[PDB]
Amino acid sequence: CTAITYVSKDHYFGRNFDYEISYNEVVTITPRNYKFSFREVGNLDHHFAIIGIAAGIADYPLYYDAINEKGLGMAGLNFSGYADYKKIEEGKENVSPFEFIPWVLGQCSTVDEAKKLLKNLNLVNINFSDELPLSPLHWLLADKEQSIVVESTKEGLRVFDNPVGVLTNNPTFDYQLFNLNNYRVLSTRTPKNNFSDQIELDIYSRGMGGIGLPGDLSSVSRFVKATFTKLNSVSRSSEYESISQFFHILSSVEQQKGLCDVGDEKYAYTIYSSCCNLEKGIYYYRTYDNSQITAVDMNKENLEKDSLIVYPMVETQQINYAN
Amino acid sequence: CTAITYVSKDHYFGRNFDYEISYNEVVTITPRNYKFSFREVGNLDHHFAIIGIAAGIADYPLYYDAINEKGLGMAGLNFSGYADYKKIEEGKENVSPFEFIPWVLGQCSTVDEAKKLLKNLNLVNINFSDELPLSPLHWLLADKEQSIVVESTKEGLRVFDNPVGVLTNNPTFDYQLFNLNNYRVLSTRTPKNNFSDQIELDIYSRGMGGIGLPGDLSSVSRFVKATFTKLNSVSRSSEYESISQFFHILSSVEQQKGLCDVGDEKYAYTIYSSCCNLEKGIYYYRTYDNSQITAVDMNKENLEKDSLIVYPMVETQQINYAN
Amino acid sequence: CTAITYVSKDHYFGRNFDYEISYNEVVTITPRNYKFSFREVGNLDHHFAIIGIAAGIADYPLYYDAINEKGLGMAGLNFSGYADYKKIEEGKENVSPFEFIPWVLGQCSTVDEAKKLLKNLNLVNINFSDELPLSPLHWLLADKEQSIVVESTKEGLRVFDNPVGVLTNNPTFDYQLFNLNNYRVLSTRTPKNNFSDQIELDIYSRGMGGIGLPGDLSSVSRFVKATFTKLNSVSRSSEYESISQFFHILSSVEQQKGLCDVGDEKYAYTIYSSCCNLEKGIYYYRTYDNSQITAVDMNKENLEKDSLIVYPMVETQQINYAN
Amino acid sequence: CTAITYVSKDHYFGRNFDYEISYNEVVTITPRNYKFSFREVGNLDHHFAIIGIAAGIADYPLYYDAINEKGLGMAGLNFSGYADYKKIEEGKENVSPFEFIPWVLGQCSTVDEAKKLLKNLNLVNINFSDELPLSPLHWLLADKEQSIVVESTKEGLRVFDNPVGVLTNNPTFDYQLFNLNNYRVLSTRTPKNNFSDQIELDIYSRGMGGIGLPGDLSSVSRFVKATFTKLNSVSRSSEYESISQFFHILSSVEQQKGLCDVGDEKYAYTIYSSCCNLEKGIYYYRTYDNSQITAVDMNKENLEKDSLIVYPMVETQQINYAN
Structure with missing residues (x-):
């Protein structure tokens, strides 16, 4: 998985969901008066409306990621072997x-x-x-101001500021930022010949600025590539151009089927890619086998209801036959 | 640019078109009786019908790439500094x-x-x-049987068998093939700890078999990653599944605006990505700002005509507002 | 700087000293009755004998590294921006x-x-x-049993077990070990063609198993290369063949004059390389400009002396002229 | 194998010889009247004196490399699968x-x-x-003016100007030179943060300008590292500082025992490193098991003699015991 933010004119939040098996992913709008019961803290009977993709195997909204009606997004990503969850602690929420x-x-x-x-x-x-x-x-x-990372590990709970607005999987976020230091030289422009002024070295290609950028599907490599691609993306003129750019960023680190064997020829791939407009409360998405973007607008629902609004995902290729 | 062939059941051919300014790219079908006049060889008044994308110019179909009704595909990719075209030579075509x-x-x-x-x-x-x-x-x-590469350079004209079905930009195809030798260790599966049996190294991420795969937008790196992505790709034989996988391959090496500055903030990007089914004579494409796949099927035209049939490209996001 | 342990039959400890200026380096034997007066802990009037290289700028043994007569070694290596030293603390030594x-x-x-x-x-x-x-x-x-690393940083004082017997400079030892995870595939043997079984890739060089091993003079790169070379070294059990292998390991990560510009054409270089036989109390050294190994044997001295025994370092090439 | 030239007042020529078995290597001087009989061309009864290292497996001087008394050096390096020798051709030499x-x-x-x-x-x-x-x-x-590469391959005989003064093993020299283009950004100095101006990246280590330099033992990687290390070396004009720098260039890409398994735990290693002063006719060398530099001065023999003069190689460590 890779989650990113991106600023064009509006502010966007979203992620690749990368896994080897799809359950029943659904887009779920949780309205304000859907009561949130919590096992150990106060219930929120009236709360901000939420739209996200969720596992469609329960009556409760099990969001993989979501934004709320006030322009705040949140996403959970695999953290295998690193995540540690605690016993109940008196005095804590x-x-x-x-x-x-x-x-x-x-x-x-x-x-x-x-x-x-x-x-x-x-x-x-x-x-x-x-x-x-x-x-x-x-x-x-x-x-729209900033992002943060929340990591609960053996050492404890840490809340980092995210200066790049990207997150992938393992390891801890302090290591991910530190590893960026190794890439200070990469550039969007053709580098000078610093190797040696004794020889002429030929600029035989465009894009030599970036040589060194890693292209594999591992968690660290994807973090570096996603970060470089997001930080250096242009902003665009319209909503449609902007979410274009956003989905281009997510495509840069997507997992194609066949390339990431996790087991007995069992293939981890980008089951869906999401892009959320925080100002408009719109949840756009693509799936592996539907390249068309679908938009679900939380503000088109009645957000004062008390029951989940659940849409299946558009999963088959939607082709424009133009002749 | 990057051009590839891929086989699922059918055989597919297509390319990323990577450049810093879009002109008037249009899908153009050349029917069988559109007379081809050649400046220095014998004319073809009747010939195979062709479909591809061209520069949108009344008097001649200036193709960037195309396929014919017989399932042969061809594409020109940039080769700046290496290409060499010759004086008229007697006894040659x-x-x-x-x-x-x-x-x-x-x-x-x-x-x-x-x-x-x-x-x-x-x-x-x-x-x-x-x-x-x-x-x-x-x-x-x-x-459907093979691909070749044609390079006219200062030393002369070579025709190479292409055992990987991939082409990008500079240098010569022999170098490109050779360089793959350096990537023999890349894998879709988790590597063993060959580094030392004296220490335990942790598999902290999925996809570690690909580490060392270049992710930059230069010509050689894009060649390596397209090749690895294409050769290790998997897909169902169904058409939608097959073109989906093909477009993911092209996505793996596309150029995002902002990341390849070719001189004072003029950015090279993947203006369009095509996928052509050689058996069915269908030209499918996505554009930088339209993620939905568009199909133009040469067989729905009257291929006995003698005028160009030109379609504007669908260039803005075609979004499914599902709620 | 790079420091390593190595076992053949005997156990060896030593380092490369990599810096832009020499502080009058000398081989110093600190005998047993040389009184140590510590500023905040108790004096040691009788102690183990020590042999190391030191900065010869005081009648006090300002060691960069040393071993003692009981076969324990210690080395200080640059940790700039990470080291933090403390205020005097009650109840501590x-x-x-x-x-x-x-x-x-x-x-x-x-x-x-x-x-x-x-x-x-x-x-x-x-x-x-x-x-x-x-x-x-x-x-x-x-x-002869183990090695450890000591880091006093802003977060505090940590003592690590060192499973590879290597240390360089920044960052903290936990990153340095974790980063090894990235090199699990490196091998001393020619790798299989895992890239794709659809194509034949030629083994055009010996040594391809190591491709990916970093060759620059940075601290993490040098850590990775010294670790791989050390753990995969072989040699027979004799003194000369053992120390030979040891200096070969240090040579792999030495810094050549001109290659590491720290400032205004100021060159950090490997001023010396050391190898100490823990069992025998012999300090072996080479220098940048003397490729011959020099040996100083702690045990040929009167270790009941009370004053420093100082040998100059041979710093000009000692050449065997064969005719 | 790696062969290099280097200039520092005088002009130096030399090589690492890397193989997994020894053929009784000796320094051999061939004096001006030792008769050379050639199978298909004219004999040289009188000729220039030569010094080099040869396989001591025949009474004929089977030189791996050598220099003559006139300042011309030549070395033979492994080119396995690439070299192709011909049938006798009328009108050739x-x-x-x-x-x-x-x-x-x-x-x-x-x-x-x-x-x-x-x-x-x-x-x-x-x-x-x-x-x-x-x-x-x-x-x-x-x-002292220039160097050249001679490659007889299946396609024919080529002679290249060598603008870097370096050669290793496979592939052909034109690919070796082309590949340097990929490393145009490496520097002896710390690079700026080009990655992104939006974040701060720390210079946590010295030599970061070199990151990307390959450090494995394969033919291309050693060519690249030897080239960067030779071209960026700082020259001292005196003889000992000059040959000292030269031997550090060759140490940079030496092959350590255990790291290059050529099959069945048989290990390729740098058996010797040579440095020849072309002006003075001195063959300086080290061996894997002797760090001290040994020197053989051709001009101290009677070069008017007609029989080979052999200096067997020193193959124990020559340790300077200082106390």
């Missing part, structure tokens, strides 16, 4: 990983607001159900 | 680069037929017009 | 970094003995003199 | 590769005379004996 996105997005308008709520957080090892045990995750949260 | 796609596709049903035709070729330095001078190019040709 | 090698090598026979001593350590910010401010360092220690 | 160093060095004082002598060369597939079959080789020749 005890929240399960499965409840975590509803907990933040339900009551925070901004990243700064989330940073305060996170001050007494303790992420507790409580499964949604016996059938559906907790996944190991870390989180990126973002609004 | 003297053919300009701008005429080269119509010359081969017009009378060749297979790559083998192209091989025999190319024995007598001399590519000559004649512009289409004073306003429209030749580009430096080389060519990938392909059918 | 407050040792200055300039006293640190004497403190440990004077009273410990083994790494395990050093580990106990290190539990109570606080490295204090006390300069040898107003004319010689403290250097930012971190330390490798080693005996 | 037909020379076996075993004859080639005596043929050239016997009678040329400069690289230009070598160029003229080479114009009609045909390297013929004729063994020294039934017992010693030819080795597949290419050559570096150098004098």
